[PDB]
Chain A
Amino acid sequence: ELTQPPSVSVAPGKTARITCGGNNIGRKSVHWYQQKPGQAPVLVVYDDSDRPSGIPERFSGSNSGNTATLTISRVEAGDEADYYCQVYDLWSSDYVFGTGTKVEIKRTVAAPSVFIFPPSDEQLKSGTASVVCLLNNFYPREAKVQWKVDNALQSGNSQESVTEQDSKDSTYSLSSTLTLSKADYEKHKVYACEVTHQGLSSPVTKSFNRG
């Protein structure tokens, strides 16, 4: 039922290849849809290797029995999107899509710009505090944001939401928040944020004293 790799990462200038494997797929019908964050799918390749009006000739399709592959020639910074393959299974009368493949553009190893945000004087009045640690423009996506509170490693009360890959420099951005009660906030002093990442010679720590 049209299984795709979870994600492929191709270097700029190189050719991205996204396979789409199913059982007895049409000899003339595999469709490819590009979907960018917050947008509707856009049909880029249809009928295995054909392309609509307006789709650049860089996109190319191919089919060899039970596996179809999408060929994005000379991948640049504006190609980060989810790609789904879709066929019309005549033997099931259903439109069947693919699991989706995320395309990450490779880049020179960028280091994260680590910032630390103490809670505001108004946020403490509500009874709950939240300390934010910002990781700005880094690559690759794999980072490790562990919270050190008075040299004591923290776990459990941290939420990480990472931005999608940028449209120009293909860099990510991570934010990790430490949400604890105002009572437990006064029980500590030095709130730190140790960021481990490739391209960093050693972990960087942006800390602050409570007050």
Chain B
Amino acid sequence: VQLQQSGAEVKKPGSSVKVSCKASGGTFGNWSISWVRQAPGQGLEWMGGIAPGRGEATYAQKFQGRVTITTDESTSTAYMELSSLRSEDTAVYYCARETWYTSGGMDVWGQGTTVTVSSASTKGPSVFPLAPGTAALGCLVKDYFPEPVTVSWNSGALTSGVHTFPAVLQSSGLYSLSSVVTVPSSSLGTQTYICNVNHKPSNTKVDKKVEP
């Protein structure tokens, strides 16, 4: 028994998005699924819930009238549709199984799907190096969209002293990310270090050799 959610989406403001929540174990059975969202850097928030076996769904008073939670048992996938998307509706949206032995809780938690609700455009990140008793060197990933960016070092050779900083929402509507490493100073003139930046929502794959 495990829940799987849909992929991250980028919907322009004022639009509507549909989020799917499929149960791995064949059918949802006689369970009930609730929806919980989480704004970036904020707390958990309950939107509603549905019992796919009884066809009845209830919504929280704050979201009542804006969300539509429906399912279909031909595929046993819960759906959450949020209309009139606003800049504050950017959040990680979870679907969780409501418990039956806890008098009010959530048992299994889905991985989470992240909408952005931004009027920005897609863009690939340019990778500028950071050239240098220890030593530190990195590659600065700048100006991209959307959020997910995976940075690896030497395609996975060194990961002990790596720090990938969280993205910074720049005023241009894009993001900025920096990844650094700590390596001994004696191995700088010999061992070559390269960072691997992978931005899937734009199919950008850049490798930049770092050296003094």
Residues in chain A near residue B61, CB distance under 8 A:
92, 94
User: Is A40 part of the binding interface, using a Cβ–Cβ cutoff of 8 Å?
Assistant: yes
Residues in chain A near residue B58, CB distance under 8 A:
93
| B contact residues vs A (CB 8 Å cutoff) | 34, 36, 42-46, 49, 58, 60-61, 94, 96, 99, 102-107, 109-112, 126, 128-132, 134, 136, 138, 140, 142, 163-168, 170, 176, 178, 180, 182
| A contact residues vs B (CB 8 Å cutoff) | 26, 28-29, 31, 33, 35, 40-43, 46-47, 84, 86-88, 92-100, 113, 115, 117-120, 122-123, 126, 130, 132, 134, 136, 159, 161-163, 173, 175, 177, 179
Q: How far is the CA of A51 from the CA of B168 in the complex (A)?
A: 38
Q: How far is the CA of A94 from the CA of B104 in the complex (A)?
A: 10
In the complex, are the beta carbons of A97 and B129 less than 8 A apart?
A: no
Q: Interface on chain B toward A: helix, strand, loop, or mixed SS? A: strand
Q: Contacts A115-B136, A119-B128 known; A161 to B104 CB distance under 8 Å?
A: no
Residue ID in chain B nearest A124 by CB atoms: B128
The minimal Cβ–Cβ distance linking A192 to chain B, given in whole angstroms, is 17
* Residue from A41, A46, A123, A177 within 8 A of B99 (CB atoms): A46
Residues in chain A near residue B111, CB distance under 8 A:
40
Q: How far is the CA of A84 from the CA of B94 in the complex (A)?
A: 15
* Residue from A84, A122, A134 within 8 A of B43 (CB atoms): A84
Q: How far is the CA of A100 from the CA of B142 in the complex (A)?
A: 31
Q: How far is the CA of A150 from the CA of B140 in the complex (A)?
A: 24
In the complex, are the beta carbons of B106 and A113 less than 8 A apart?
A: no
* Residue from B105, B112, B170, B176 within 8 A of A40 (CB atoms): B112
